[PDB]
Amino acid sequence: SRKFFVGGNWKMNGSRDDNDKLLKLLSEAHFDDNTEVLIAPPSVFLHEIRKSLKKEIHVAAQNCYKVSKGAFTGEISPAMIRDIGCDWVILGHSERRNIFGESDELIAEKVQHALAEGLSVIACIGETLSERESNKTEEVCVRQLKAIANKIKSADEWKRVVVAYEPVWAIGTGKVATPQQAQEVHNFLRKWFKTNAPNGVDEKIRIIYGGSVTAANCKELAQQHDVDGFLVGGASLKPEFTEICKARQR
Amino acid sequence: SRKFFVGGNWKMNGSRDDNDKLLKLLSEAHFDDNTEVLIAPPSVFLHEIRKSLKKEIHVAAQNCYKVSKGAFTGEISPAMIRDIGCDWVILGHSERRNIFGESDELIAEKVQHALAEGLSVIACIGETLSERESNKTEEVCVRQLKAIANKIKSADEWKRVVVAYEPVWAIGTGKVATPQQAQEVHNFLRKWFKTNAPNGVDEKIRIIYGGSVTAANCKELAQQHDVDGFLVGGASLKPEFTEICKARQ
Ligand SMILES: [Cl-]
Ligand SMILES: [Cl-]
Ligand code: NA
Ligand code: NA
Ligand code: NA
């Protein structure tokens, strides 16, 4: 059975005093062996947070670039992420795709490079409100996923990928996908893997939901057949995050 | 008189081992009191490098965004840069403009925000080979500078700005600008500041040159009347960086 997976995307939020309070709450929570837990702080805090935080909790960069070093002022590399002792990265987040213009191919290139360095990847996909209204949800999701899958050449590589489906219109808007909306997307996503990725990957790959997940709505979403966890944004800065990590419990 | 200013832009280069060997040579060197020195490591190394390095050497983030917090996955804010104890940021670098498509206006919004947060800012401008060959150098530099100046409303803000002129065709190409080409742009920029910034900014603002600066070419550039220093890229990873910092001598 796929291990349940809850990541917390802090986005552009953090400071020594705020981080210390949040990490104190995280360290004191008790997470069962059945739940895999990840936080993603801003890049300037990654090294110190990884040093102090227990190793059962992942510490991810929120973005990285697609080569180990070079003339890319402002960018960090998977080698740099490994050098500071972190093992994960979020790639293709909608804010990077939309506000910063990162293309499908750029995300695919980043994912392939991160996997080549030994990282695990949360690879983000999703459709806008207008794309959904035009009944393009699957077309858009499958385009973004296919670009990434085209650079993943073996089934072993897919073991270090978690797919996050986040409808753009649910991100930070308070407007979560209904449990039926989420299950329906994740189901055709898993079917796409069954058809298009190496045998067996469909049954192992975690597909997590993101977009206005809170403690008030996380339990019904977690009971959905093809939902394997969450990418939590605004709520990952609050005490209720530890409650969202228990989403599968009664 | 304006203090000589030398910055090292590491770009996307850095690791605990490589950083340690670099900072040792840098922490052992001796610079005269009229030289201001700055390094700019990748964001993941900023905090620990700032903690261990003598305060007189600045440590700059290589980029930041234009508000203090929000839903901008992968970005960092002036407030975070200050929280980890750094007081500088490079904004508007050629690589952000020409690889990541940062517009003049986005750059100007960033500078205004970093300045309002109390940071000091290296603001980069410069023209392409095509632009230079169309005799568009001054028009391009002014367009870029003017977007920033529009958001800056005080000599006090301009006090914490260092302008880096970096011809795009000189960055990483081995084609440095001659002392004469550099001086010609720097003199024109200082003239533009006299009319387009509050009184006295032109006399104060450091205009530093960037683009294939090496220990082999820096002294002649440093002698030009309006060149106040250097933004150094590839050579800033090498021991000869400390020589470039001594270019006025
Ligand atoms: Cl980790
Ligand atoms: Cl500093
Ligand atoms: Na640790
Ligand atoms: Na198959
Ligand atoms: Na004036």
Author numbering:
A (entry chain A): 4 to 253
B (entry chain B): 4 to 252
What do the authors of the reporting publication say about this deposited model?
Helminth parasites are causal agents of diseases prevalent in humans. or TIM-barrel fold composed of 8 alternate β-strand and α-helices. three invariable catalytic residues (Lys, His, and Glu). enzymatic activity, leading to the concept that TPIs are obligated dimers.
helminths, we solved the crystal structures of TPIs from T. 2-PGA at 2.1 and 2.3 Å, respectively. in the presence of 2-PGA (TsTPI and SmTPI) and in its absence (OvTPI). and TsTPI exhibit a Tm of 75 and 57 ºC, respectively. interactions in SmTPI correlates with its higher melting point. illustrates the positions of residues TsTPI-S213 and SmTPI-S215. stabilize the SXD/E insert in SmTPI and TsTPI. TsTPI and SmTPI harbor 6 cysteine residues in their primary sequence. whereas only one thiol group is accessible in SmTPI at position C221. inhibited by targeting its solvent accessible cysteine.
